[PDB]
Write a protein that binds this DNA or RNA. Structure first.
Lengths: 241, 108, 171, 15, 679
DNA sequence: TGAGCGGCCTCGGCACCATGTGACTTA
DNA sequence: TAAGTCACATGGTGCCGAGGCCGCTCA
C-alpha cells in the first residue's frame, strides 16, 4: 500500500552533483542510486535509443514503514521532448521540501501527471512484465479488475466494474497469440467484442491487479516496495508532447 | 400540419430533381474528361467566357437558411467577442496597475 | 410536433441551397467545357466573376419571390409569419455588432499605448540595471536569535496567562 | 509578392 | 462623528438610541471604538443583552483598525487568575460576541493562539488564527503541540472539529513540519462538526450595514466591491479547506525594499511558484511584478526563465497535459503580449498547422493575446510566413465541410488588428497593407463567405478591414502608394452583390473615404476611373433603377440581367423591371426601409399605415389609390408625394444618430447632385 | 418571512474477500 | 538455508439503516 505520486520535470537534471547541498539542508545523508536501464528490450518496442537513467533517491533513516521510507524515483532520457519525470511514495513532509529544493536549485517546471485510459491500459500492460536476474522477461499473470465510475444524468449508473480472473486473462492472451502487451491486444479487444464497451473511451478510474498493484488516474499504489522499469518507461512516454 | 407536410414533399421533390441534374451534369463532364486526353488545361478564351456572361421555392429556402444561420452566427459572435472583451478589460486593469507600479519603481 | 416540422424543413432548406449552389457551379463549368474542349484552367479573375454572377442570381431570386409572398399580406400562411420572424431576428443585432467592434478597437488602442509605455519602461530599467555595481561568526548568531525567539514567546505567554492588563508588541 | 499572389490564386482555384 | 464620542463621554436610554442611530448613519473612528469598548468592558451597570446588542449593532469601523484597538481589546479578553485578581471578570458571552465581531472585521499570531486555549472563545478564535497563518514559516512544532494538546483535551466542545480545521489549514499551507495527518487521525473522524465549522455565517444584515457605512466612508479607500471580494475570499479560505547580506526576491514585501538592495538582490530559480498566483505585505503581495523583475535583473535574451516558462506551459496546453488550460493562458498572454522577443518566438514556434491540429481553441486564444500587439523585428519574410499560416488554417477549416467553424475568420480579425497596429506606425506600413490585401483576398472566397451559406464572422472581418482602410485613408502625413487602397474590382463588385446591410454600409464608407482622399489626386488615373466605376455601379444598383440602360452592372452586361428576369414569374406585371432594383429592392435593405417607414408613421402619429409589406412603385401607387382623399388632406408622412420623395424621407431617417447605417445615406447624399442639398 | 420535503451523506455495524507475517515443514 | 503449506489476525471494499443538516421551496 505505497501510493506513488507522479510529477514531470521540464529539464534533464543531473543528481550526482549538488546532492551534498540537499544533504546539508536536510541534515541527513540520502542514498542516491544510479542505474542505466534499457526498458524496451523487445525488438518490436524499439532497438535504438532505449537507454534511460534511473535515480533512486531515498531519505534513509530507519526501515519500519513509509513514514521513514518515502522513496524518490527519477527516470530520464535526453532524446525526448520532455526529458525527466519523478515519482515518490510515502507521506513524509520532507518530500515537498525536496521538491522545493529541486525547483529552486535546478530551475525546473514541475506539474502533476494524469493518466488517460489508454495510458492506464499500457501501465497495466507494463506492470506484469518482470525482469529476471538471468536477463529474461516474465509475464506474471494477475486477476485484473477494470473499475469504472461513469457520470450519467440523475446518477443512473454511478459505477460499474469488470472483473477478469487470472486464468481467463492468460487464456485470452494465449488465444490472441505470443504478445507482450496482453491487456491492450487481447483483454480489451475481447471486452469490446463481447460487451460492446470501448474501455479506452469509457471513464476508467482504476484497474486493480489483485495482490500486486492498483493504478489510478492520478496515483499508482503498489504492494511491492518499488516500481518496475516498464511502468516508469510507459509513464515517460505518457507525458511526451 | 398538412400544408407543412406537402411543402416538405414539394421541396424534397425539388431536391431530387436537382440531384438528378447534378448526376447528369457530372456524368457529362466526366465523359468529356474521358474523351479529352489533354491533361493540361487549355487557356480559356475571353470571348467564350463573354458569351457565357451573356447567358444564364428556391429563393424562399435561400433567404430562410441565410437569415436563420446568419442570426445564429451573429449571436454566437457576440458571445465570443464579449467574453474576449471582458477578458481585455480585466487584463488592462491589471496592466495599468502594474504599469503604475513599474513607473513608481523607475522613479525610485 | 410543429418543432419537428421546423427542424425538418430546416435541414431540407440547407440541403436545398447547397445542392442548388453546386448545381449552378457544375452547370456553368459544364457550359465552359462544352463550348471549349478542355479549358478548365480559368484564372482567379474569371472564377470570381462566375462567383459574382452566382451571387447576383441567388439574391435576385430571393428578392424575386420575396416580391411574390410579401406583396399582399395574407396574415394566415405560417410561411408569412416565418418571414417576419426571420427578418426581425436578422435586423435585431445589427447595431450591437458595430458597437462591440468599436469598443474593442478602442481597447486595442489602449493595448497599443500600454505596450509602448511598458517598452519605454523596460528600456529605461535595462539601462539603469546595467549601471548598478555587481553583487558582492554566525554560529552564535543563530543561537542568540533562537534565544530571542524563546524569550519573546515566553514573554507573550506570561503576559497573556497571568492576566496582565497591558499587552503590547515588545520587540 | 508575385509568388505569394500566385499562391493565393492557387488557393482560389482550389476553393 | 462628534455625536458618537459625545455620547461616549456622556456615558462616562436616549443616549443608547442616539448612539445606535449615529452608528447606523456614520460609524465610529478607531479611537472612538477604543473608548467605546473601554467603557463597555470596565463597567457592569449596562445590561448584558444591551452589551451584545451594542457589539453586534453599534461597533462599525470607518477605516483601518489600528494596532492599539487590538491591544486594548486583548487586555479585555483575559481572565482573572492567581496573579491578577483586582480586575473584574469580563462576561464570557461578551468575550465571545466581541470575538465574533472581530471575525466580522509573528507576535500577534502567538497572541491569538494563546487565547485559543479559552474554551468559550474557540468558536471564533479559529478564523483569526487561520487568517493570520499566511506563510509556511509561521507554523512550528510547538504550535502543533499546543493545538493537539488542547484539541484532544477533555472538557471542551468545539476543540476537536475546529482544531482539526486548524491542522488542515496548516497541512494545506506549509507542506513541512513533519507529517501531521496522523495527528488529524487521532482527533475526531466524524466529518460533521468540522463540516459545520468550515462554513461560517457573519450576519449578512450586519455585513450590509457595514457595507453601506463603509461606502459612505472614504473615497478610493475600501470601495464596496473590493471589500465584498476580500470578505468572500477570507470566507472561501475557510470553505476550501477540505482539499542575510543579500535579500531574496520572495522576502521583498514593499517597493521601498527594492531600492536600497537592487545590486544586492538575488533572483531565485523558483519560476513555477512566482508565476502562478491581502492587506499584509508578504511574498505574494508583490507577485505581479516578479516576471518583469527577472527580465530586468537578467538582461533580456531568449534564454531567460519567464520565456522558458511561457513556452513550456503553452506546449503543455497544446499537448493537453494541463487539466485546466484556462488558468495559465491569461498568465502567458499577460507576460507575452509585451516583450517582443517572447511574442515573436511564440509566433515562430506555434503559429503553424501542426499546433493548430493539436488544439485550435488555445491557439485562437494565444492569437488573440499575442498577434494584436506584435511588431516584427525582421520585415522581410513576415508576409510569406503569414500567407502560409493563413492558407494552412483556411485549408484546415475548409476541409471539414462545416461552415460553422470560425477559427480562420477569428484569427483573421486578430491579424487585421495587428495590421492596425502596424499602420499606426509610419514604418513597415506597406507590409501591413499588402497583408491586408491578402486577407481581403482570402475572406471573399466562396467557400466560407457565400450568398447561400452565410458567415457573419467573415463579414465582421471584412468590415473590420474596411474600417482600417477608412482610418488609413484619413492620414495625410504618410506618403503611402496609391495602389494600396484599391482591392481590385473583383472584391468590390462581389461585396456589393452580397446582401449584408452592415457590409454594404462599410463599403459605402470605404468609397466615401477613398474618394475624399482621391479628390486631390489627378482626375484621370488607373484607379480614379476604377472608383468612378464602383460608384456608378453602386448608385445604379441602389437608387437609379436604370440597370438595363447601363453598359454593365458589376462587370455583367444587363442582357443576362434581363434574361434572369425572363422566366421569373411575378404575381403582378405592372412595373416588373424597376420594382426591386432600388433601396427598397435590395435584399438586405428591403425590410429595413419598411421598418423605417413604420417608425416614421409612428413618429408623426399617422392614422394610416402602409398595409403592403413591400415598398415599390406599384404598391405606392395602389396605396395612394386606395386612400386618395385621406392622403390628400392629412394622416401620413408630410412633404412626400412620390416614391422618390419617400426614398429621400427614408434616407433622412437613416442619417439620424440611431442606426449603424449612416454611411449609405451619406453615400447617396454625396454622389448625387439631386441629393447634394440634404447633406 | 417560515415551515418542509428530498438528495446528500456520514456514522457505523455487518458481511465478505483480501492480505501480510510468524510458525512450521521440505529440500 | 530457499521455498512451500498453514492458520491466524488485521486490512479493506461494499452495503445499508438511521439521522442529521442542507437546499432550496413554496405560501
Amino acid at each position: 500500500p505505497y501510493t506513488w505520486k507522479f510529477l514531470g520535470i521540464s529539464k534533464q537534471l543531473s543528481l550526482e552533483n549538488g546532492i551534498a547541498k540537499l544533504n546539508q539542508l536536510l541534515n541527513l545523508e540520502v542514498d542516491l542510486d544510479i542505474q542505466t536501464i534499457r526498458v524496451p528490450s523487445d525488438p518490436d518496442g524499439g532497438t535504438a535509443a532505449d537507454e534511460y537513467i534511473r535515480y533512486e533517491m531515498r531519505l534513509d533513516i530507519s526501515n519500519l514503514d513509509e513514514g521513514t521510507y518515502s522513496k524518490f524515483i527519477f527516470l530520464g532520457n535526453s532524446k525526448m521532448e520532455v526529458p525527466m519525470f519523478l515519482c515518490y511514495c510515502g507521506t513524509d513532509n520532507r518530500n515537498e521540501v525536496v521538491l522545493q529544493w529541486l525547483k529552486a536549485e535546478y530551475g525546473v517546471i514541475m506539474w502533476p501527471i494524469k493518466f488517460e485510459q489508454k495510458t492506464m491500459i499500457k501501465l497495466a500492460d507494463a506492470s506484469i512484465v518482470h525482469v529476471t536476474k538471468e536477463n529474461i522477461e516474465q509475464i506474471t499473470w494477475f486477476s485484473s479488475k477494470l473499475y469504472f465510475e461513469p457520470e450519467t444524468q440523475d446518477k443512473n449508473l454511478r459505477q460499474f466494474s469488470i472483473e477478469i480472473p487470472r486464468e481467463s486473462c492468460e487464456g485470452l492472451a494465449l488465444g490472441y497469440g505470443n504478445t507482450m502487451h496482453p491487456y491492450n491486444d487481447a483483454i480489451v479487444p475481447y471486452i469490446y467484442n463481447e460487451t460492446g464497451m470501448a474501455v479506452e473511451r469509457l471513464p476508467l478510474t482504476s484497474v486493480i491487479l489483485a495482490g500486486h498493484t492498483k493504478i489510478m488516474r492520478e496515483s499508482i499504489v503498489t504492494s511491492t516496495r518499488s516500481l518496475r522499469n516498464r511502468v516508469l518507461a510507459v509513464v515517460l512516454q505518457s507525458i511526451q508532447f | 400540419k398538412d400544408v407543412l407536410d406537402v411543402y416538405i414533399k414539394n421541396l424534397e421533390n425539388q431536391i431530387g430533381n436537382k440531384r438528378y441534374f447534378l448526376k447528369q451534369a457530372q456524368g457529362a463532364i466526366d465523359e468529356i474528361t474521358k474523351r479529352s486526353l489533354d491533361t493540361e488545361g487549355k487557356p480559356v478564351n475571353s470571348e467564350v467566357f463573354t458569351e457565357l456572361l451573356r447567358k444564364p421555392p428556391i429563393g424562399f429556402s435561400l433567404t430562410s437558411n441565410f437569415l436563420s444561420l446568419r442570426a445564429q452566427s451573429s449571436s454566437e459572435w457576440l458571445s465570443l467577442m464579449n467574453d474576449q472583451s471582458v477578458d481585455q478589460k480585466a487584463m488592462l486593469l491589471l496592466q495599468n496597475n502594474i504599469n503604475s507600479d513599474l513607473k513608481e519603481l523607475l522613479r525610485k | 410536433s410543429s418543432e419537428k416540422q421546423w427542424e425538418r424543413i430546416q435541414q431540407l432548406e440547407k440541403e436545398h441551397v447547397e445542392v442548388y449552389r453546386e448545381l449552378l457551379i457544375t452547370l456553368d463549368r459544364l457550359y465552359l467545357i462544352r463550348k471549349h474542349n478542355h479549358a478548365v484552367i480559368l484564372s482567379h479573375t474569371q472564377q470570381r466573376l462566375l462567383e459574382i454572377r452566382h451571387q447576383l442570381q441567388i439574391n435576385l431570386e430571393k428578392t424575386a419571390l420575396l416580391i411574390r409572398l410579401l406583396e399582399k399580406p395574407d396574415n394566415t400562411n405560417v410561411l408569412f409569419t416565418k418571414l417576419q420572424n426571420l427578418l426581425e431576428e436578422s435586423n435585431s443585432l445589427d447595431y450591437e455588432l458595430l458597437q462591440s467592434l468599436g469598443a474593442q478597437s478602442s481597447l486595442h488602442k489602449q493595448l497599443i499605448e500600454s505596450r509602448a509605455e511598458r517598452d519605454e519602461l523596460m528600456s529605461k530599467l535595462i539601462e539603469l540595471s546595467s549601471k548598478f555595481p555587481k553583487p558582492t561568526t554566525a554560529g552564535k548568531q543563530v543561537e542568540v536569535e533562537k534565544e530571542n525567539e524563546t524569550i519573546q514567546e515566553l514573554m507573550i505567554a506570561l503576559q497573556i496567562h497571568s492576566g496582565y492588563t497591558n499587552i503590547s508588541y515588545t520587540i | 509578392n508575385d509568388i505569394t499572389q500566385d499562391f493565393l490564386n492557387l488557393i482560389s482555384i482550389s476553393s | 462623528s462628534l455625536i458618537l464620542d459625545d455620547i461616549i463621554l456622556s456615558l462616562t436610554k436616549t443616549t443608547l438610541s442616539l448612539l445606535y442611530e449615529k452608528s447606523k448613519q456614520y460609524g465610529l473612528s478607531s479611537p472612538q471604538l477604543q473608548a467605546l469598548v473601554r467603557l463597555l468592558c470596565e463597567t457592569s451597570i449596562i445590561d448584558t443583552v444591551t452589551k451584545v446588542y451594542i457589539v453586534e449593532n453599534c461597533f462599525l469601523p470607518d477605516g483601518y483598525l489600528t494596532k492599539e484597538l487590538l491591544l486594548e481589546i486583548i487586555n479585555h479578553l483575559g481572565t482573572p487568575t492567581v496573579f491578577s485578581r483586582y480586575r473584574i471578570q469580563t462576561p464570557p458571552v461578551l468575550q465571545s460576541a466581541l470575538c465574533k465581531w472581530l471575525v466580522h472585521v509573528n507576535i500577534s499570531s502567538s497572541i491569538w493562539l494563546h487565547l485559543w486555549q479559552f474554551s468559550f472563545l474557540q468558536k471564533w478564535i479559529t478564523p483569526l488564527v487561520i487568517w493570520q497563518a499566511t506563510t509556511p514559516v509561521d507554523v512550528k512544532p510547538w504550535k502543533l503541540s499546543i493545538i493537539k494538546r488542547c484539541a484532544m483535551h477533555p472538557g471542551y466542545r468545539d476543540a476537536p472539529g475546529s482544531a482539526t480545521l486548524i491542522l488542515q489549514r496548516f497541512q494545506c499551507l506549509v507542506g513541512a513540519s513533519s507529517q501531521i495527518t496522523e495527528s488529524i487521525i487521532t482527533i475526531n473522524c466524524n466529518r460533521k462538526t468540522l463540516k459545520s465549522h468550515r462554513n461560517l455565517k457573519l450576519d449578512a444584515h450586519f455585513l450590509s450595514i457595514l457595507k453601506r457605512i463603509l461606502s459612505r466612508a472614504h473615497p478610493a479607500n475600501f470601495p464596496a466591491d473590493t471589500v465584498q471580494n476580500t470578505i468572500d475570499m477570507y470566507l472561501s479560505e475557510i470553505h476550501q479547506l477540505g482539499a542575510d547580506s543579500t535579500v531574496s526576491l520572495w522576502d521583498v514585501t514593499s517597493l521601498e525594499q527594492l531600492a536600497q538592495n537592487w545590486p544586492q538582490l538575488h533572483i531565485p530559480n523558483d519560476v513555477d511558484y512566482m508565476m502562478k498566483p491581502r492587506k499584509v505585505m508578504s511574498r505574494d503581495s508583490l507577485k505581479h511584478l516578479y516576471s518583469s523583475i527577472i527580465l530586468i535583473k537578467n538582461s533580456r535574451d531568449e534564454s531567460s526563465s519567464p520565456y522558458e516558462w511561457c513556452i513550456w506551459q503553452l506546449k503543455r496546453c497544446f499537448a493537453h497535459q494541463i487539466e485546466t488550460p484556462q488558468e495559465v493562458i491569461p498568465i502567458i498572454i499577460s507576460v507575452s503580449s509585451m516583450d517582443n522577443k517572447l511574442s515573436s518566438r511564440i509566433i515562430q514556434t506555434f503559429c503553424n498547422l501542426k499546433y493548430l491540429k493539436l488544439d485550435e481553441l488555445t491557439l485562437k486564444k494565444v492569437c488573440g493575446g499575442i498577434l494584436p500587439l506584435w511588431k516584427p523585428e525582421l520585415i522581410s519574410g513576415t508576409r510569406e510566413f503569414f500567407v502560409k499560416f493563413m492558407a494552412s488554417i483556411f485549408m484546415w477549416s475548409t476541409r471539414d465541410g462545416h461552415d460553422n467553424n470560425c477559427t480562420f475568420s477569428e484569427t483573421c480579425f486578430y491579424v487585421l488588428q495587428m495590421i492596425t497596429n502596424w499602420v499606426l506606425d509610419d514604418k513597415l506600413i506597406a507590409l501591413g497593407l499588402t497583408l491586408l490585401h491578402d486577407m481581403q483576398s482570402l475572406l471573399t472566397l466562396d467557400k466560407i463567405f457565400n450568398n447561400a451559406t452565410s458567415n457573419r464572422f467573415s463579414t465582421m472581418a471584412f468590415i473590420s478591414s474596411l474600417d482600417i482602410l477608412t482610418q488609413l485613408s484619413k492620414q495625410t502625413k504618410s506618403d503611402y502608394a496609391i495602389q494600396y487602397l484599391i482591392v481590385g474590382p473583383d472584391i468590390m463588385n462581389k461585396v456589393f452583390s452580397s446582401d449584408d446591410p452592415l457590409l454594404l454600409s462599410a463599403a459605402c464608407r470605404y468609397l466615401v473615404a477613398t474618394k475624399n482622399k482621391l479628390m486631390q489626386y489627378p482626375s484621370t488615373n488607373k484607379f480614379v476611373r476604377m472608383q468612378n466605376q464602383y460608384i456608378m455601379d453602386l448608385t445604379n444598383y441602389l437608387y437609379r433603377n436604370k440597370v438595363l440602360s447601363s453598359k454593365s452592372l458589376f462587370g455583367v452586361s444587363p442582357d443576362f440581367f434581363k434574361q434572369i428576369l425572363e422566366n421569373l414569374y411575378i404575381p403582378t406585371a405592372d412595373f416588373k423591371n424597376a420594382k426591386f432594383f432600388t433601396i427598397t429592392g435590395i435584399p438586405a435593405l428591403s425590410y429595413i426601409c419598411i421598418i423605417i417607414l413604420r417608425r416614421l408613421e409612428t413618429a408623426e402619429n399617422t392614422k394610416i399605415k402602409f398595409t403592403s409589406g413591400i415598398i415599390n412603385e406599384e404598391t405606392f401607387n395602389n396605396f395612394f389609390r386606395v386612400h386618395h382623399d385621406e392622403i390628400g388632406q392629412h394622416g401620413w408622412i408630410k412633404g412626400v408625394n412620390n416614391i422618390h420623395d419617400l426614398r429621400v424621407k427614408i434616407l433622412m431617417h437613416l442619417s439620424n444618430t440611431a442606426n449603424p447605417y449612416r454611411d449609405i445615406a451619406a453615400f447617396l447624399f454625396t454622389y448625387l447632385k439631386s441629393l447634394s442639398k440634404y447633406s
